[model samples]
Target: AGQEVAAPATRIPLGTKTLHLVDASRQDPWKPSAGNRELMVTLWYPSLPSREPAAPYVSKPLSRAVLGNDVLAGVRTHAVAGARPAPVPRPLVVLSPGFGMSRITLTALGEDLASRGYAVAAVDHTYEAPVEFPGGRIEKCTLCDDSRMDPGAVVRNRAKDLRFVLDRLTGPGSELRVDARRIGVAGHSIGGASAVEVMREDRRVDAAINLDGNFFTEPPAEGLNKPVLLLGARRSGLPEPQENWERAWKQLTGWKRWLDVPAGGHMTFTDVPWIVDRFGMPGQIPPEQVEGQLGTVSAARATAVTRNYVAAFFDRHLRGRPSPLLDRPSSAHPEVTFMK
Candidate 1:
């Protein structure tokens, strides 16, 4: 649904904090995929506090460790986007990147959400995602082709991790500081599924947003009264994982919405298109996609489009902002078409 359009002049305001969480449920870190261990993560929160030293965008070692020598060889880093801390007891949001993807991928989103006065914490689920740390340690998620793994258990565990993060941040276990209530959840791909599952299991997550992930298991079925948002690019009006959004749509009893942005083609959600557009399809993505995805739209346009829709949705639902962008379709946003 990207048409190389101009983005709304919305500012992203967020502050950065690094955190390490220990999971008793996880095994030792000795295994290639840890059974249970401590995971590193960076939290993006809205702040009204004074400015301070900045943080690194990502750990280069992670790129080298996972993508081999190529990705890290000349990979340019994104500067951390940080803002003054917000007032205490702000709304909370949790963002989960796709499995194998680094939490860095959601930095743009973290900042965008935080700017809107939500305390956004994007986690790097250990042994299941990528993350960067101090001391030259860059972590990459190694879980591949995990078809045999129990999806429910994994989602439940992830939901638990988020609760723990929330508890720690707002309650007794907290090392970092942020708001506790009004916590929302969002994710892409499998992380998208994780978002929904987490909301299902834990009431701490007030809402769930799915960025076009295939939901293999039935979501809600009939009784999820929580507010939910579904974002998809591949197909207009089609549900995820073969009717995931459909079933979820029919079952949700609370405020809910489904949107299909054209030109999404899966890759748009990730920076894959941005990189391809900037570098002219370095071949990391197939030759076919390069021409189709980024070639059709400018990087600025694509990025602007993403920033707009994501922000609008969260702002409307979370902060109760009046956004006509979501209420009715207009020529103003030709890129966004109604799901129905």
Candidate 2:
């Protein structure tokens, strides 16, 4: 218990900024006192290395709420706070976390993509995440586990939140340089499911990837023409399984692939596996927990597979680069199965 856990770092040196965006047209979903929907976002982009310190991997309040203490405060990431963005306009990839999950969990992937020269933005959906705001205020899940909750409605609302976020980031005077015509979306769990809804409702998104989402809200009956990637976990039971994934799979009319990692879990696509792989303070986190979350795969292997595939998909679709890895299973990463 006395051993300190090492902090997780991003693979690429990153320049990041936090923004408080308000959609004045919509009402706040959690706090009614606020007439508009406000979101906290972490924008990760390529930047020149600077002397500024790396950002805290997780806020103290968030660490306390999720991990039971401020032990995570000691963890740091490679992203530099307030570093200037690279001057070139790059493709933008927006990431949405699983339901009741914080955007910080997706930081690893964001940093990976940003390192590859893509602008990555992760949204801490208001009331859906334990998002830390500008004033040291942490926003918890307001809609946590309501038995009567409509899954489709919540996803649809997330689509709206996504649309609003797109408006702010892609629209006029955006501080971060964004390539308007080349926008991508990827999410984990329910957030992955909502990517389909977002693409159907909004045409601005060029491509989308669903990271092991169950797809509660089905795609349009007429079918969607945009390129989509269905990256599922072996635990997600892809191929002929999951009514929503099957239905959504059939509805996609453009380029698509259904790839799943063997023995991965619902949270495997996030940073949890990497944390256990690197900073696994055995005293703090049980081995069974890591096993349950990531199956038998080593944390580093799991992260490399997850990050490589996701980056390849975006690279091929958004950047017009060819990724031979996505076309077939490679000897390099045989653990990933591309389902027919």
Candidate 3:
């Protein structure tokens, strides 16, 4: 059984485009047999009002790979595919998904950011997920079966992927007029950790946000001056910090906020919860098991809180628009807790 998945309403109409990019500079690290590193980038941007068909959530092959069925084929997105973009220079935010998750999983966040006057680009790191390219070619995850795969190398490669995406989006003869000076990066899981690495390596990144991702790459010992946000799930049992967040917290030298969702699961920061809640799983997977993966927090609440915080972070850092939501606790989002 499946229902059309829905992302929260947006502030403005959104347009989406799929870009097949090839990084001729380097070979595919996971599969050297595959020539250059090819990426599938989904771009969401503000668009002039038009009646275009909504975008599909993911390709049928990708849906089958991740969900074991074609359920996502019917899932409609909020953004209009190939719609005309609004003529203006917009801040750019590059997004990366969790390990083994396709870039399509970040659609909700990307559409939300685009609705709020930002150009959003979500990348499908080849061989890291089931990435479907034009002419019906699908690249499955090569590292998924590798038990000894190095997490550091994964994030480092992702950092390189994000940097290359930025170079293409901000470079001349680009599809969107991206405000190069006001660029930021955000990601979920390992993708989140890669955000930190990219910010450290590339000065073009003004800020970064890690959504419940543990740091695999160590933050600089001297500290990074750029703004960073560490948003994570609340840990049960002891109040001890989880993962490498504590170490990262101490090294974040610039303006930063450590916020946690008291009832969120590791996948809560992603679109997984939203889609799963709306459209139940494929087979005999118990409802409780499925729900457990997404935590007890309702999908609507999780999406709202995430969109608000992420938009505020970019707005403050990229657009020079300060939001009190980031400065202090708000009654509106009581589920979010300010952490040390």
Candidate 4:
């Protein structure tokens, strides 16, 4: 077994995996449900000595239901794109999905990070939104009253979920071979809020990246001293949540950074854009048909920038590598208004 695996000089092959973990007695205490529970987690990462299997970026049922059945919106499916054989333990990252959303939607960052040598796991929160499981059961998220669920409880529940997922990887009866010290977190929307809460609560996570999630009395409020990165959402032709930006910026006490991608909407940060052709988006079809001609520069920039910056951040902080990119990206990215 001492035969050294040929390292791909260009880039690591991002592999895909799925796990069915049971947290029997580990049910989230604050959630509305009380009983033994099971969670399905989708993963993207650097494979071992063998070729990594490809997992669908976003499942078909989730696409038509959550995203509009359109053709222009880019949704990247299949977390593992070009995986070459050679599995090794990679830095583990936990991804949280937005409220009323399924974990399948986070293919964008999941694939990108996996390609760069990090294993990203996006948890499918059952009944949190409308999620079609392998069985005939069509479970909706905990969101009730024709709207999202409680704010405080949402973060609390998600925080618990992330913690449980981490425990499985590091705890017994686990097959995952991970570099525990290199673990980090990322999430979009409500998922992002989960990142904030988990980073503070879970000491196992080394760093975190939050993509446009409104905080639910967490992250900075809990005094999360770890390095945190925030990406503000981009509307078509206007600034978003200027007020929250100011408050969050002022509240940041640790090593923090921010960026605004010009053309991306709240959903652009995920894989929906990259694989739009495979999974038609119903909500963004018509107007985006016209807007598609304009280009995906903004969202693309967001994906690329987030990928490089994230890799650099973890490489330096977690892997003990020197990365100049983490200092600041090139000035050529004018659309990305960056700050610290």
Candidate 5:
């Protein structure tokens, strides 16, 4: 029997809310019939501890569409659904998922950041993933179709989506109390690439992080002067850097680090490995086989390493707090290599 997947425990109590945002100014790039660009966002924030039930990992339809089954619907998270949030304005960190991947894949990281006092918002780009909107409607990924797929276009569109999200989240009458001055952007896969693209386009982004993603658009020749973190995978052995990363590295002139995990795979930064490890795949695919897609790093180790480094990055840039972990390699996290 497949077991329920659980996000790693957090330090503080957390609450989560779903937001349906529509930008009438921009038409849907993927599905014009849908009219304005629509997005589903999940906000995780520090909350007053409560005895309420933990939130479900994702909607049943989304779980099925993303994982091929409804098993993820039962996945447990530390955040309480609709719980009262701690009354404090916090720095905001917006997150975006990889191409064709649901925003829920970034839940674990979002929850962790929220527990650490950051308002975390994860965006689900409509038509890019299987997103469940206000109604019972489930919009599957139209971008998954090869004919409709354009990496460069997708990255550009996502940057717009992210900017619109920031406007809504930080504007007047926003849902959460956010310090507009302190904002960071992070994403997995294409979403990661969008982080760089958005930072280059918008001056609001104080810092950015790319978690194991390729850059589809080139950074400016002058380089981005903001703080950037490039967290990538290297498997069991050190391999050549991706061409995009190599090009982007030279153009990152400000505070930056190119960190690689020797035992991590592409999916290691997401919650996929943790879920697959606890809950066997629908077709009886062994958990080991599924986890292999995440590299040799154990799920527990991967989660810890990712949370620590990401939090450190934002803390340093946004909160004026820095961690030694970012300065140099540590014996504590011997798995992480500071790449040149």
Candidate 6:
């Protein structure tokens, strides 16, 4: 059994806007007969005059798909819905969710980046997650079963989605003010793999961070020529090196760092830890299962660590600011280990 849990509100006032876009030039891969490729993107940025209403933590359809009924219903967002934009061209970061997961799952990270002065766009790859659009249309995942699909192809399609969103955001007629030259992408699971795919295929992405994801598609030989950070979550019982992470590490010729969190599991990099911490019933999910999935670390600690590293990485690469936090063996964040 699961209970509704509140997301920890962001540190600064946030402004948010959702964009519904259509790539008329291409047909939808999953719903080819329906029409062109459609996308739902949410942009979060720092704002004040904080009187606007906060956005819901998750949409009704998304909450139903992932959690028990709108389990995140009353949870409030740091971002005010349709708040006025903070004047100034800010840096941008794109976030992608794991397979079959809603983009709202990355709200914490988005709020963090936005509060710290970055325009964050969280993209929902249509037909890959339950995206509730206007007029009560919710796009359900049509490619859940990986056995019938090519994983690499899915990542490439996601790469295409990222590029399209970038074009729309920085393109003419876009009202949102953003520094087009300073942009990065971060993602979890296959979403992280998509970050690798996007950086390799698109020149717009300045840097990227892969959160506990095994790269499914190999990158080019020349490398991305931009900074990349690989945050790996170690399995609870196994200390062995992950082959996929190691393989991708070799391909990165430019600035890169590999850090591993020993106690974390695959979902540790996500908001699952924080949500599970609010679970009411003991043994509702086995303790071992919890430790194996969300990590042995306290949820609060995990969130702090996640927020710090992600912000530090983007700060150094995008803002041209040097961060000493990237140095190995910090006494402050002991959970992090330089995998090199």
- The per-model lDDT (C-alpha) reads 0.62, 0.78, 0.84, 0.64, 0.85, 0.80
Taking every candidate in turn, the Cα RMSD to the unseen true structure, in Å, is: 4.7, 3.2, 2.2, 6.2, 2.5, 2.8
The C-alpha stretches of model 5 lying farther than 4 A from their native spots are: 1-10, 235-241, 282-292
TM-score of each: 0.81, 0.90, 0.94, 0.78, 0.93, 0.92
Better of 2 and 4 by TM-score: 2
- Order the candidate numbers by lDDT, best to worst: 5, 3, 6, 2, 4, 1
The weakest ten consecutive residues by lDDT in model 1 span 1-10
lDDT of 2 by residue, 1-340 (tens): 2332222234445798888998888887556785788888889898877888788777778887656677666777677998977778889999989888888888878887888888888987788767788878887787774666677877888899899889988988886879988999999888887776798889899888888877776557788988888887763453444555677778888888888776776577887766656555565556566544577666666667778888899889888789878899888987788775
Q: Write the per-residue lDDT of candidate 5 for residues 122-206, one digit (tens) a residue.
A: 9999988889988789999877886858798999999999999999998988888798999999998899999888988999999
lDDT tens digits, residue span 54-122, model 1: 444444466554444334334422223455455576777788776677776666666656555666678
Residue 222, candidate 3: C-alpha displacement in angstroms = 1.5
What is the Cα-based lDDT of residue 317 in candidate 1? 63
**lDDT tens digits by residue: candidate 6, 161-256:** 999988988988874778999989999888998987898888889899988777777678666667888987783235444777767877888899
- Mind giving the per-residue lDDT tens digits that candidate 3 earns over 75-147? 8887888888898879999999999998888888888899889999999999888889999888888889899
Error of 6 at 216 (Å): 1.4
Q: Higher-TM-score candidate among 2 and 6?
A: 6
Candidates 1 and 4 compared by TM-score, better number: 1
Best by lDDT: 5
Q: Where does model 6 exceed 4 Å of error?
A: 1-11, 235-241, 279-288
The worst-scoring run of ten residues by lDDT in candidate 3 lies at 234-243
Which candidate do you rate higher for lDDT, 4 or 5? 5
* Tens-digit per-residue lDDT, 147-254, candidate 4: 545677777777888898999886665556677868888888778878877878888887888777777663355455677778755532334465566566676677
Candidate 1: what lDDT? 0.62
